[PDB]
Each structure stands twice: as structure tokens, then as C-alpha cells.
A = this chain, B = another copy of it.
């Protein structure tokens, strides 16, 4: 029994499901019109009223989810929480009304998941184009057979476009055209690329496209296909009205009336830019993509594994070295975990494992400043399957893997605590250093790690450094590096005369 929750701009959505004989099956769906993006202002601060509204919904969502284990639930946040400067404050307050962490995801991860949701709900063959127009952002993907090919997101949605192009809710040809051209403008750099890739079928998701389809059926269209001609009919109808408040289109809810016009403008902008001839509405979207992702992970299908393996190929990472560092780092990790079990968490363990595998990702840029270059790539790339904090954590572990360490600029995390991840930096630094000689590395048959808080002792075999003098110099340098970090101390020992 799983649940996927999507904290969007216009609404918060939830889906609950189970798996029977390998097949997914929906138990319940929940939706509450929260208007999170409405509370977003000039300074990009969520208002106290919108935050109160959202907290009230998460308590209701937590009520429905009473008894669900953290593993059976995924809550994601999108455009509005990506742009809110006080996102952290909302997240922290949310902690007291819903016991599952909120995971902010990037626009390109959101687009990827929407595509997966459409693909899993709409299992119709062919290369698909997937469009999703939201309250704050718009996603566009071309893919086939659950494999994305092109993935994009743009900061345009019905809420933002309402304020920018329809001040006070005013409807006219000029306001509409400006909004439509603005939408095409945002797609300028991808039109040739998307059109030359092409698609067998185009599918549209979420509220704006759904309303467009419903108004068309109300206005006499014989089938549900959205076409350039039919969109022009919708525009003509819209322009018969002077304001969003008097937008009396058959089939529109009072709520949809506040955002339908800017949404339609973006939709027209999309069709204009990509020259879509036929678009059908999909019942799948983000929450379904999330639901299928979490389920695949219970079956040990984790796209992040593929992400890490593809990064290794893209950047020509020495796999033999990656594996040496991983083995060394994790041999020490198991001991650290053994001695401080309350601080060890499987999610951070996974991130440490990928950090070890990817610490040399920036080598093809330069060995000089390698930790900074590796961190640059990991922090700024598109990493399918990673949420924002996971991505930033992995980059952070890599950022501090060698040379002088001052933790002045350490990022804050809502999902991870310093007591849990600082020791992973210590472990990775030691794991890397011990493998400096690459293929010439002599690996000790045994290596004992003894921890007393952040005062660590590494005990090597009897007389080991007599044949590994350079390693000892590297360790003595690391001891000096740890002296800069308050609380950290490194001691090196060797087993005594037998």
C-alpha cells in the first residue's frame, strides 16, 4: 500500500495504491485546492495565509495516511516550492502536521516523472510528446517505451502569466497575444530540436489541458482531439468576455475561470512552436510517475543507478579506481556504523556510495581543483531519480573529498543533519587518500577504525608503513587537515610486535 503526494501551484494532490499479482491498482485519490502560488509575491515569499491553508491540507492528508510507514509514502514539491525563498520555513512547519518529508524536485525531474506517469497510465505504443501546463511551470518531453529522449521545463504557468499579461483579470486580443507570443518565446531554443525528433502521438496532462478539452466537447466538437483549428475556436470564445470573472464558458468551474485564459495562451504558444496537429488528454501525470517510481524501487529498480553509471561513461571515469575507493570507504563505513548505529541511515549510505563512485567525475576538466570540478558537475547536472537535496548532498560529499577543508560554506539540508553526514565526508576523504597510488596501491589486509565522536583512530597491520612510506606521509597531511575542523582529530596506529 503506497501513496504519492504532489504539492503543486494550484492544488495539492494525493493517490493511494496497492500492487496485486504485480499489477498496480488505485485505492483512493485526494485533491485540495490550496492555491500555494497565489501567496507568492514580488519578493518570492509565500504568504502566511497560503502557508496556513497548505498546513491544513497536509494535516488532512496525514489523517488519510495514518499508519503508513515513511517507506510507503513520497511527497514531492515543484515550481512554487522551488521558487519560494521561505520554502524551508514551510517545510519545517509541515514537519508537525505530516510525518513524511517533503522532497523538492527540479523542473527536469518533474518533467521526467510526468512523462513516466503518462506512459504508465496511457499504455499506447509509439514515440510520445508529453505536455503539462501547470500553475507555475510547463513541462515538455519526447520519449518512447519509458525512456525519455528530450526533457525540458520552462518557468511559465497560468498563475504567473495571469499577473504578467492579464492585469486585474482583463481579457482582450492584445493581452492574449502578448501572453501567447511570450509562451512561444520561451520555446524558441527547442522547437527545431523537438520537431526534428518528432512524435507518433502527443499527450497533454493536468488542469489547463483538461479544461480546454472539456470546453471543446461542450461547444460541439465531435471528438476529444485538440487541434490548432479547435484552439482558435477557444480563443474566439474567450475574447467574447471582458474579464476572468465573467468568463462564462460551458464546463468551466468557478476556480478554473481564474486561470483558464493564461493557461490557454500557453497552450496556443506550445502548439504554435511545436506545430502539434493532434493532442489527446492523459489521465496520468506527476503523481502517477511518482507512484510507479517508488514501487520500482521496492523491486530494486532505481533509475539513480543508471544515472550514476551513465555519468561514469560521459566523463570517462576510471572504473577500477572508483571501485578501489568505494571498497576502502565502505570497509570503514561498516565499522563507523557499528560504533554509532543511531547516526547511520541507508539513504545517506547510498549517497556516500555514489560519491565514492563519482569523486573523479571532474577529472577530465582538471586534476587541479578536482574536488571543486567534480562537485560543480554533480551540483549542476540533470540527475534522473535524484531530488534536490540528494543531488546537493552527493555534490557536497565530493566537494570536500581532498585538500584543505573549512566547512564555513556547508549548505543547510532539511532532509539530512550534520551529525549524520559529516562522518561520511571523513570516510570518503580517507577512502580516496588511501588509494592515491591507483593501480600501485597496496591495500592493507586489515584496517581497523576506532571512533570516539569525531576523534578517529586508523590501525594498520604490524610494520605496514615500512613498505608504504608514501601512504604514511599522506595520512600525516590528513591529520593536519583535520586540525582545522573543530572536533575532528585523526590518529594513526599500527598493530604491535606480535
Contacts and interface: CB of A to CB of B under 8 A. Distances in A.
A349 interface: no
A364 interface: yes
Interface string A101-126: 00000000000000000000000000
Contact of A181 (B364, B372, B440, B473): B473
Nearest to A184: B470
A380 interface: yes
Given A376-B376, A380-B373, A470 B188 contact: yes
Contacts of A372: 380
A474 B188 contact: yes
A192 B474 contact: no
A380 B376 CA distance: 11
Nearest to A377: B365
A175 B153 CA distance: 62
Contacts of A366: 380-382
A367 B190 CA distance: 10
Interface string A343-380: 00000000000000000000011111100110011001
A438 interface: yes
Contact of A381 (B184, B188, B365, B380): B365
A23 interface: no
Contacts of A368: 380
Contacts of A188: 436-437, 470, 474
A471 B440 CA distance: 58
B191 A152 contact: no
A7 to B, nearest CB: 21
A388 B257 CA distance: 59
A367 B106 CA distance: 13
A367 B382 CA distance: 9
Contacts of A438: 189, 192-193
A470 B193 contact: no
A200 interface: no
Nearest to A196: B439
B436 A181 contact: no
A469 interface: yes
A152 B470 contact: no
A145 interface: no
B380 A185 contact: no
A314 interface: yes
A189 to B, nearest CB: 6
Nearest to A372: B380
A335 to B, nearest CB: 26
The 4 closest A-B pairs by CB, nearest first: A192-B440, A192-B439, A188-B436, A192-B438
30 contacts: A181-B469, A181-B470, A181-B473, A182-B473, A184-B470, A185-B470, A185-B473, A188-B436, A188-B470, A188-B474, A189-B436, A189-B437, A189-B438, A191-B440, A192-B437, A192-B439, A192-B440, A196-B439, A314-B364, A365-B376, A365-B377, A365-B380, A365-B381, A366-B381, A366-B382, A368-B380, A369-B380, A372-B380, A373-B376, A373-B380
Interface of A: 152, 181-182, 184-185, 188-189, 191-193, 196, 314, 364-369, 372-373, 376-377, 380-382, 436-440, 469-470, 473-474
Given A184-B470, A188-B474, A376-B376, 4 more contacts: A188-B470, A196-B439, A366-B382, A368-B380
